[PDB]
Amino acid sequence: EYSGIIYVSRLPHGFHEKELSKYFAQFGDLKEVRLARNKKTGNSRHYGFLEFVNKEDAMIAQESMNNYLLMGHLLQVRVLPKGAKIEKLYKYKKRVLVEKGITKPVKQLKDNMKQKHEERIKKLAKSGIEFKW
Amino acid sequence: FVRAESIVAKTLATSREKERIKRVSILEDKKAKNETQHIASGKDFILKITEGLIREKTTYDGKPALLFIVRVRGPLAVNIPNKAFKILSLLRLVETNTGVFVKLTKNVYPLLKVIAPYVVIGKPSLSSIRSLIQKRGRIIYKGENEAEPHEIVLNDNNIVEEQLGDHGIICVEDIIHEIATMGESFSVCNFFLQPFKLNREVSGFGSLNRLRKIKQREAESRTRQFSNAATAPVIEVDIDSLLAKLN
Amino acid sequence: RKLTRALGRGEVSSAKRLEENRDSYTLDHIIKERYPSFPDAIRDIDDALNMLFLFSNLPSTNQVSSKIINDAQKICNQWLAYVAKERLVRKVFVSIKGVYYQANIKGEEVRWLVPFKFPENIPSDVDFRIMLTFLEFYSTLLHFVLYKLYTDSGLIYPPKLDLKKDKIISGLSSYILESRKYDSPVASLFSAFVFYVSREVPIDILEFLILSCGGNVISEAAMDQISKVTHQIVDRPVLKNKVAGRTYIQPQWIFDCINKGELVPANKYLPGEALPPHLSPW
Amino acid sequence: NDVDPIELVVFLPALCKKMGVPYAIVKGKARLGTLVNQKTSAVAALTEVRA
Amino acid sequence: AIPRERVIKAVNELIKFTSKPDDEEELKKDLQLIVVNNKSFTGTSKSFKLKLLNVKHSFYKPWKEASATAVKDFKVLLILKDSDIKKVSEDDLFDQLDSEGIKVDEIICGKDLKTVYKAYEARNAFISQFSLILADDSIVTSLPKLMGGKAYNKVETTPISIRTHANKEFSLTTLTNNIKKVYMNQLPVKLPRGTTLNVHLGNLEWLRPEEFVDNVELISEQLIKAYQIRSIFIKTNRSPVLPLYYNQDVLDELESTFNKGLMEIANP
RNA sequence: CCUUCUCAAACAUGUUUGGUAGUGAGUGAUACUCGAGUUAACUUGAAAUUGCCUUAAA
């Protein structure tokens, strides 16, 4: 039938995990609040899940915010069926780049790029593309 | 109750304020190291706005200057960040309608750039300084028969003579002289004086006062500008007319 | 009511038009009804002057507004400038409450009280609406009296003020009085005298008294913003090196000379010696 | 919603539905009047809007 | 730098590879220059500013003269400040750019971007229809928030900064000179955070192979003095890479005033 | 129910340098540099079901 799990979508930019928790704790006690985010960048996928201790509170929240127009977003709220525990929604951060070490010596890597150039030459000769050297 | 629109608006405005303060902090670290190869601009700008309004964007000469700083209400739906709150608390500007004197130098300019959207910054004239001190002058003084000190007006020159006389300050006129000339014991006088509690220019909620509030908000929006540009000039307004309205 | 309707409907431009197209009441006909004679108004302006000088010294609050206080200060400065230029002061008494001045305006003795430039605390126990009503009436009456006095003397009312002098020292010196021997000896005192008033001395009191008993004043406080000196008025326990050609004195010498009418000898008034008692002229 | 006599707008929802016009019943003819600079207004319409 | 005979043979082979006998007949005849750097080009910092490489031969004039039979024809967008949008009109650009055959279809401002094209669908539809977007270097810094990140995924939709101010005032002559210079002499190139950099030389029918050879030789000669490059390749879409350069020595490069102000503003 | 870095220096109107970190989801070809970083171009309503300070106050 129905569970105490709420699926929210068409979220605005500023609606995040703590904002959803602060807004829906008014409707009722929340077991868990999760937000779908991208893995490599810290940007919302504009949907998430929440879990009320009371399924009646979840139903009240759904009939309250089902078609709420918010900052140009017509919010969508659904009550999930029995079961379907929310999982695998990690609060990712913004990842950064950093240069690691290169264990290959200079002579070996120059030889490897020369062999790669030779392989390109062989590929060009096989293809019928007459490029010199 | 709290509305989701208010929550999201506060979140977005606070995030943009934090982004602005972070960019200003990065630029100030680069300027402090003062050898960075990559920088947009490496100098300090002053945008003086006077009165139909004219704005002059000049450089900062670097010589110390006298400023009056008034704490005004900040941007709407913005939670004040820790850095701005720390600077305002060190300047004793925790609440609005409160004014202090600041000796602006090269190391004072970045703090003003950080706290720009919460303060009105001006050059006080001698008459404005004298009117401010003689009208609203308060100190925290500990009486001999008093178990705990309290805040009283700057009414007695004997208290000034017994608290700052060793530094050479005997009276309210001497305090005014040191504040105006930015001389010796400027910090001592400026912290002997409590922060100046100004009154609001428009108060009340009748129809006349609400229309005056609309006009005041229009004028303030026209004058004050929020650049959010990490190299924004420090904006200087007519603090003489502002204090004439606020005192 | 109509402005409330416009604001409630959200017609802010209409509200601005309604606020601009209104006319306030005036008290000129009431002034003429209550004072059929200019001497009667002169004999009644004492309480008006006291109230105006009181309200020109208060800070702006929720009940008392900056515009009201600035108007009161402006009319008080105009009165002081007129009295100083026409040289009409006769008696001065510096009591702990304030300075009592007595000037002869059109053959009538007018006494008023001026507080010192200190931040007096508001009792928050007084009928401020009643006092502001009295202030409105007194302001209208003193506007009428000042116009008549300036026009009788042959001056322009209201006199224009100098912006730079107002931004240096907001006193009676900022109002320059334009047009189109005096009675001995109070006005004739301090003739060809230049007083260098030191920083610690109340500049408004000393300058008004000297200029009313005409002389020149050079203020040390006014020099903060950035030869002919004869006397120097100081009040300090320890005085630095003194120029041999300048007479050093204390402010009580001015008060005693003004109340005596003659030039009280200055050997009794020195920075390092006790002063004679400041006797009341009344 | 508060139009008296009600016959002035009682046909309007059905007419809008038949013509395919989007419509909404709102509370306050005084509110619609403030919208159109009148004391009251039984109806309001958005026909052409800015980009 | 690059051998003339080598690059001539490379260009002839790439133009011969396309003409062996949807978008397959349009995208497979685009000439691309690949530059491989020893380290990251910009460094650890992402860059959205396009680098302008100045060449001998025109690039957008052939684009305009070849877009007459193209579904997406050639379009130029001009971005100007709000205070400067009222000083110029389309006639003021036509009379100054008609001699060289330069036409600007649309001029917008930041207010137009923030109001008319605020919605994502309208913004994409407006941005995608232009091939050369130029912006004032004053307002160029605010454009990542205004034009969005989808507008920066392409070289042609990435804005180009120009110097429209001479002696701290907007000058129509300086604006037109910078627009003409960008149209004729220089080309835009996206500097990446990696090592592989892509340059779109254009279409095979736009210019003669001699013009392509001269342009790529000048590009190599300028880029050598610009940065210490490692490898140079020439390709067409759906084709392998033909190397044109090989060097060794550039490889061995692999192996509190804030508290002062607080003290100044604090008494204890 | 907020509203977006709208620019600087240096040399003689020109020249050089620096300043820009993005709605999400999906389709995709192709090569390059050591599970990481880049590289042609196409779709979409602001689309979506889970990758461990308080007088802007009552």
mmCIF file of C-alpha atoms in Angstrom, chain B:
data_model
loop_
_atom_site.group_PDB
_atom_site.id
_atom_site.type_symbol
_atom_site.label_atom_id
_atom_site.label_comp_id
_atom_site.label_asym_id
_atom_site.label_seq_id
_atom_site.Cartn_x
_atom_site.Cartn_y
_atom_site.Cartn_z
ATOM 1 C CA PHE B 1 5.630 28.284 10.793
ATOM 2 C CA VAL B 2 8.410 28.781 8.233
ATOM 3 C CA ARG B 3 7.800 28.734 4.485
ATOM 4 C CA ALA B 4 9.912 26.782 2.012
ATOM 5 C CA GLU B 5 10.289 29.873 -0.181
ATOM 6 C CA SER B 6 11.795 31.804 2.739
ATOM 7 C CA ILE B 7 14.116 28.894 3.573
ATOM 8 C CA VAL B 8 15.375 28.569 -0.013
ATOM 9 C CA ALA B 9 15.752 32.340 -0.461
ATOM 10 C CA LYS B 10 17.809 32.554 2.735
ATOM 11 C CA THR B 11 19.953 29.621 1.584
ATOM 12 C CA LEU B 12 20.664 31.128 -1.847
ATOM 13 C CA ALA B 13 21.380 34.626 -0.523
ATOM 14 C CA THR B 14 23.686 33.280 2.200
ATOM 15 C CA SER B 15 25.542 31.130 -0.342
ATOM 16 C CA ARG B 16 26.109 34.114 -2.645
ATOM 17 C CA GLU B 17 27.306 36.221 0.300
ATOM 18 C CA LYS B 18 29.754 33.463 1.261
ATOM 19 C CA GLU B 19 30.992 33.303 -2.342
ATOM 20 C CA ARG B 20 31.595 37.067 -2.362
ATOM 21 C CA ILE B 21 33.466 36.974 0.954
ATOM 22 C CA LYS B 22 35.547 33.988 -0.197
ATOM 23 C CA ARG B 23 36.561 35.772 -3.409
ATOM 24 C CA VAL B 24 37.468 38.931 -1.478
ATOM 25 C CA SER B 25 39.520 36.842 0.970
ATOM 26 C CA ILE B 26 41.404 35.111 -1.862
ATOM 27 C CA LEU B 27 42.199 38.463 -3.484
ATOM 28 C CA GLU B 28 43.337 39.876 -0.137
ATOM 29 C CA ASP B 29 45.655 36.918 0.485
ATOM 30 C CA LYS B 30 47.142 37.440 -2.982
ATOM 31 C CA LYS B 31 47.588 41.159 -2.268
ATOM 32 C CA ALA B 32 49.158 40.433 1.129
ATOM 33 C CA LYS B 33 51.723 38.135 -0.469
ATOM 34 C CA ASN B 34 52.101 40.998 -2.988
ATOM 35 C CA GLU B 35 54.049 38.977 -5.564
ATOM 36 C CA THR B 36 51.292 37.016 -7.334
ATOM 37 C CA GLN B 37 51.702 36.686 -11.098
ATOM 38 C CA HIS B 38 47.935 36.338 -11.696
ATOM 39 C CA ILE B 39 45.656 39.050 -10.294
ATOM 40 C CA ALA B 40 42.856 41.152 -11.763
ATOM 41 C CA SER B 41 43.668 44.454 -10.043
ATOM 42 C CA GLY B 42 46.198 45.176 -7.330
ATOM 43 C CA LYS B 43 45.136 48.506 -5.840
ATOM 44 C CA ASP B 44 42.437 50.075 -3.674
ATOM 45 C CA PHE B 45 39.559 52.146 -5.069
ATOM 46 C CA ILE B 46 37.235 54.657 -3.395
ATOM 47 C CA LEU B 47 33.837 55.377 -4.968
ATOM 48 C CA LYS B 48 32.524 58.677 -3.594
ATOM 49 C CA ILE B 49 28.820 59.222 -4.326
ATOM 50 C CA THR B 50 27.422 62.743 -3.914
ATOM 51 C CA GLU B 51 24.385 64.704 -5.066
ATOM 52 C CA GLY B 52 20.998 63.495 -10.132
ATOM 53 C CA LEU B 53 23.876 61.751 -8.372
ATOM 54 C CA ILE B 54 27.566 61.816 -9.297
ATOM 55 C CA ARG B 55 30.119 59.082 -8.573
ATOM 56 C CA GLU B 56 33.894 59.558 -8.602
ATOM 57 C CA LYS B 57 36.062 56.422 -8.546
ATOM 58 C CA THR B 58 39.516 57.437 -7.310
ATOM 59 C CA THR B 59 42.501 55.527 -5.989
ATOM 60 C CA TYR B 60 43.534 55.205 -2.353
ATOM 61 C CA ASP B 61 46.577 57.365 -1.613
ATOM 62 C CA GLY B 62 47.493 55.152 1.346
ATOM 63 C CA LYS B 63 47.684 57.907 3.951
ATOM 64 C CA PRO B 64 45.532 57.339 7.062
ATOM 65 C CA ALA B 65 42.032 58.792 6.936
ATOM 66 C CA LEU B 66 39.172 59.355 9.368
ATOM 67 C CA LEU B 67 35.943 57.452 8.734
ATOM 68 C CA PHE B 68 32.575 57.214 10.425
ATOM 69 C CA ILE B 69 31.023 53.764 10.026
ATOM 70 C CA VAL B 70 27.290 53.246 10.610
ATOM 71 C CA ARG B 71 25.864 49.740 10.962
ATOM 72 C CA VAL B 72 22.826 49.492 8.684
ATOM 73 C CA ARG B 73 20.600 46.498 8.035
ATOM 74 C CA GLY B 74 22.269 44.128 5.600
ATOM 75 C CA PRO B 75 20.977 42.344 2.507
ATOM 76 C CA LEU B 76 17.590 40.679 2.803
ATOM 77 C CA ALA B 77 17.428 36.996 3.815
ATOM 78 C CA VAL B 78 21.198 36.825 4.371
ATOM 79 C CA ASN B 79 22.713 34.956 7.294
ATOM 80 C CA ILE B 80 25.841 36.945 8.169
ATOM 81 C CA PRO B 81 29.028 34.886 7.649
ATOM 82 C CA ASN B 82 31.569 34.285 10.387
ATOM 83 C CA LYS B 83 34.257 36.560 8.920
ATOM 84 C CA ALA B 84 31.958 39.573 8.536
ATOM 85 C CA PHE B 85 30.447 38.928 11.971
ATOM 86 C CA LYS B 86 33.936 38.757 13.505
ATOM 87 C CA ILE B 87 34.992 42.057 11.929
ATOM 88 C CA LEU B 88 31.738 43.783 12.936
ATOM 89 C CA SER B 89 32.007 42.465 16.505
ATOM 90 C CA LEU B 90 35.600 43.697 16.728
ATOM 91 C CA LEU B 91 34.346 47.072 15.456
ATOM 92 C CA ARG B 92 31.503 46.918 18.048
ATOM 93 C CA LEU B 93 28.797 46.965 15.376
ATOM 94 C CA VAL B 94 26.718 43.984 16.514
ATOM 95 C CA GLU B 95 23.439 45.912 16.124
ATOM 96 C CA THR B 96 22.112 48.498 13.693
ATOM 97 C CA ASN B 97 21.814 52.267 14.245
ATOM 98 C CA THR B 98 25.286 52.153 15.811
ATOM 99 C CA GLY B 99 28.273 54.210 14.689
ATOM 100 C CA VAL B 100 32.024 54.123 15.288
ATOM 101 C CA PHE B 101 35.106 56.048 14.206
ATOM 102 C CA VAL B 102 37.764 54.165 12.229
ATOM 103 C CA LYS B 103 41.301 55.174 11.245
ATOM 104 C CA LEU B 104 41.494 53.833 7.691
ATOM 105 C CA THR B 105 44.862 52.586 6.421
ATOM 106 C CA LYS B 106 46.097 49.974 3.938
ATOM 107 C CA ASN B 107 45.390 47.205 6.460
ATOM 108 C CA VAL B 108 41.919 48.652 7.170
ATOM 109 C CA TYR B 109 40.793 48.743 3.524
ATOM 110 C CA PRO B 110 40.319 44.926 3.128
ATOM 111 C CA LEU B 111 38.139 44.745 6.251
ATOM 112 C CA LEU B 112 35.893 47.463 4.817
ATOM 113 C CA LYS B 113 35.758 45.542 1.530
ATOM 114 C CA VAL B 114 34.649 42.470 3.491
ATOM 115 C CA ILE B 115 31.984 44.291 5.534
ATOM 116 C CA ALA B 116 30.764 46.614 2.730
ATOM 117 C CA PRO B 117 27.090 45.467 2.422
ATOM 118 C CA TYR B 118 26.351 46.024 6.141
ATOM 119 C CA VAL B 119 27.778 49.506 6.777
ATOM 120 C CA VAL B 120 27.514 53.060 5.492
ATOM 121 C CA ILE B 121 30.989 54.608 5.354
ATOM 122 C CA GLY B 122 31.645 58.334 5.308
ATOM 123 C CA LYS B 123 34.058 61.159 6.014
ATOM 124 C CA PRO B 124 32.846 63.023 9.129
ATOM 125 C CA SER B 125 33.299 66.774 9.292
ATOM 126 C CA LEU B 126 34.376 68.659 12.408
ATOM 127 C CA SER B 127 30.880 70.002 13.115
ATOM 128 C CA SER B 128 29.380 66.522 12.734
ATOM 129 C CA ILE B 129 31.984 65.060 15.117
ATOM 130 C CA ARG B 130 31.344 67.767 17.715
ATOM 131 C CA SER B 131 27.562 67.396 17.415
ATOM 132 C CA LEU B 132 27.859 63.611 17.730
ATOM 133 C CA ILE B 133 30.002 63.759 20.862
ATOM 134 C CA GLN B 134 28.096 66.589 22.573
ATOM 135 C CA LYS B 135 24.689 65.068 21.724
ATOM 136 C CA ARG B 136 25.322 61.313 22.131
ATOM 137 C CA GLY B 137 28.408 60.734 24.249
ATOM 138 C CA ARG B 138 28.418 57.739 26.585
ATOM 139 C CA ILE B 139 31.036 55.866 28.606
ATOM 140 C CA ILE B 140 31.200 52.792 30.821
ATOM 141 C CA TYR B 141 32.358 54.218 34.154
ATOM 142 C CA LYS B 142 32.971 52.442 37.468
ATOM 143 C CA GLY B 143 32.061 54.517 40.499
ATOM 144 C CA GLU B 144 33.960 54.139 43.747
ATOM 145 C CA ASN B 145 30.768 53.264 45.643
ATOM 146 C CA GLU B 146 29.484 51.172 42.711
ATOM 147 C CA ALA B 147 29.841 47.393 42.860
ATOM 148 C CA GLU B 148 29.499 47.123 39.065
ATOM 149 C CA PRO B 149 29.982 49.785 36.370
ATOM 150 C CA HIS B 150 27.135 51.105 34.241
ATOM 151 C CA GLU B 151 26.714 53.297 31.168
ATOM 152 C CA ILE B 152 26.256 57.035 31.731
ATOM 153 C CA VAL B 153 26.512 60.045 29.453
ATOM 154 C CA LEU B 154 29.777 61.934 28.970
ATOM 155 C CA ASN B 155 28.707 64.685 31.353
ATOM 156 C CA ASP B 156 31.717 65.264 33.636
ATOM 157 C CA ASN B 157 35.159 66.437 32.542
ATOM 158 C CA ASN B 158 36.608 65.238 35.862
ATOM 159 C CA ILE B 159 35.977 61.629 34.812
ATOM 160 C CA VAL B 160 37.834 62.277 31.545
ATOM 161 C CA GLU B 161 40.656 63.958 33.471
ATOM 162 C CA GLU B 162 40.987 61.001 35.847
ATOM 163 C CA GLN B 163 40.752 58.312 33.137
ATOM 164 C CA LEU B 164 42.745 59.819 30.235
ATOM 165 C CA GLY B 165 44.588 62.692 31.937
ATOM 166 C CA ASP B 166 47.840 60.725 32.091
ATOM 167 C CA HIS B 167 47.728 60.438 28.297
ATOM 168 C CA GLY B 168 47.190 64.206 28.230
ATOM 169 C CA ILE B 169 43.399 64.275 27.717
ATOM 170 C CA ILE B 170 41.620 66.541 30.178
ATOM 171 C CA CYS B 171 38.199 67.238 28.646
ATOM 172 C CA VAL B 172 35.581 66.402 26.033
ATOM 173 C CA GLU B 173 37.125 69.042 23.767
ATOM 174 C CA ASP B 174 40.461 67.213 24.010
ATOM 175 C CA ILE B 175 38.714 63.946 23.100
ATOM 176 C CA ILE B 176 37.157 65.712 20.095
ATOM 177 C CA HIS B 177 40.567 67.107 19.120
ATOM 178 C CA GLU B 178 42.268 63.707 19.212
ATOM 179 C CA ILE B 179 39.442 62.028 17.279
ATOM 180 C CA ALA B 180 39.452 64.774 14.635
ATOM 181 C CA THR B 181 43.239 64.949 14.224
ATOM 182 C CA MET B 182 43.882 61.159 14.392
ATOM 183 C CA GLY B 183 46.775 61.864 16.755
ATOM 184 C CA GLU B 184 48.153 60.197 19.855
ATOM 185 C CA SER B 185 45.750 58.079 21.939
ATOM 186 C CA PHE B 186 43.172 58.007 19.138
ATOM 187 C CA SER B 187 42.398 54.382 20.014
ATOM 188 C CA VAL B 188 42.296 55.272 23.718
ATOM 189 C CA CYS B 189 39.761 58.062 23.158
ATOM 190 C CA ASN B 190 37.727 56.094 20.605
ATOM 191 C CA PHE B 191 37.337 53.165 23.004
ATOM 192 C CA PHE B 192 36.763 55.390 26.014
ATOM 193 C CA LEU B 193 33.767 56.582 24.010
ATOM 194 C CA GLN B 194 31.002 54.006 23.689
ATOM 195 C CA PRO B 195 29.625 53.280 20.199
ATOM 196 C CA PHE B 196 27.239 56.041 19.169
ATOM 197 C CA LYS B 197 23.564 55.023 19.336
ATOM 198 C CA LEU B 198 21.841 56.896 16.524
ATOM 199 C CA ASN B 199 18.072 57.115 16.156
ATOM 200 C CA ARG B 200 16.219 55.972 13.051
ATOM 201 C CA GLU B 201 15.271 58.681 10.570
ATOM 202 C CA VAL B 202 11.871 57.077 9.879
ATOM 203 C CA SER B 203 9.949 55.349 12.669
ATOM 204 C CA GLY B 204 6.315 54.389 13.162
ATOM 205 C CA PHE B 205 3.775 52.572 11.032
ATOM 206 C CA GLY B 206 1.104 55.100 10.111
ATOM 207 C CA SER B 207 0.406 55.870 6.473
ATOM 208 C CA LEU B 208 2.711 58.915 6.513
ATOM 209 C CA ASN B 209 5.559 56.899 8.019
ATOM 210 C CA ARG B 210 5.037 53.964 5.643
ATOM 211 C CA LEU B 211 5.199 56.310 2.649
ATOM 212 C CA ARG B 212 8.336 57.861 4.158
ATOM 213 C CA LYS B 213 9.735 54.331 4.519
ATOM 214 C CA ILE B 214 9.013 53.682 0.835
ATOM 215 C CA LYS B 215 10.831 56.897 -0.092
ATOM 216 C CA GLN B 216 13.760 56.057 2.209
ATOM 217 C CA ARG B 217 14.117 52.575 0.715
ATOM 218 C CA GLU B 218 14.010 54.059 -2.796
ATOM 219 C CA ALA B 219 16.723 56.590 -1.913
ATOM 220 C CA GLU B 220 18.921 53.980 -0.213
ATOM 221 C CA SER B 221 18.573 51.608 -3.171
ATOM 222 C CA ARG B 222 19.531 54.428 -5.543
ATOM 223 C CA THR B 223 22.577 55.419 -3.481
ATOM 224 C CA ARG B 224 24.072 52.189 -2.125
ATOM 225 C CA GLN B 225 25.370 49.649 -4.642
ATOM 226 C CA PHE B 226 26.222 45.972 -4.082
ATOM 227 C CA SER B 227 28.994 45.237 -6.572
ATOM 228 C CA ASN B 228 29.758 41.631 -5.485
ATOM 229 C CA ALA B 229 32.875 41.903 -7.644
ATOM 230 C CA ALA B 230 35.753 40.915 -5.281
ATOM 231 C CA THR B 231 37.564 44.153 -6.246
ATOM 232 C CA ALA B 232 34.729 46.542 -5.448
ATOM 233 C CA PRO B 233 35.631 50.130 -4.528
ATOM 234 C CA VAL B 234 34.806 51.134 -0.979
ATOM 235 C CA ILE B 235 31.768 53.392 -1.285
ATOM 236 C CA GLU B 236 31.774 56.752 0.513
ATOM 237 C CA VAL B 237 28.525 58.671 1.020
ATOM 238 C CA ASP B 238 27.524 62.019 2.567
ATOM 239 C CA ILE B 239 27.820 61.062 6.218
ATOM 240 C CA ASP B 240 27.242 64.732 7.109
ATOM 241 C CA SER B 241 23.691 64.682 5.741
ATOM 242 C CA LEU B 242 23.196 61.143 7.050
ATOM 243 C CA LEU B 243 24.131 62.209 10.593
ATOM 244 C CA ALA B 244 22.002 65.344 10.208
ATOM 245 C CA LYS B 245 19.035 63.046 9.583
ATOM 246 C CA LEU B 246 20.085 60.489 12.238
ATOM 247 C CA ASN B 247 20.876 62.979 15.025
#
